[PDB]
Amino acid sequence: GQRWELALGRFWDYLRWVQTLSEQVQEELLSSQVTQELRALMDETMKELKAYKSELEEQLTPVAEETRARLSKELQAAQARLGADMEDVRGRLVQYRGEVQAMLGQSTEELRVRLASHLRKLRKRLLRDADDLQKRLAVYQAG
Torsion angle of C-alpha atoms 98, 102, 106, 109, degrees rounded to 10: -20
125 in a labelled binding site: yes
- Collapse the DSSP code of 54 into the 3-class scheme (helix H, G, I; strand E, B; otherwise coil) and give the result: helix
Can you tell me the distance from the alpha carbon of 64 to that of 29, in angstroms, rounded to the nearest whole number? 50
* Experimental determination technique: X-ray
Q: Which helix (H) or strand (E) holds 11?
A: helix 3-20
Write out the DSSP string of 67-105.
Answer: HHHHHHHHHHHHHHHHHHHHHHHHHHHHHHHHHHHTSTT
73 in a labelled binding site: no
122 in a labelled binding site: yes
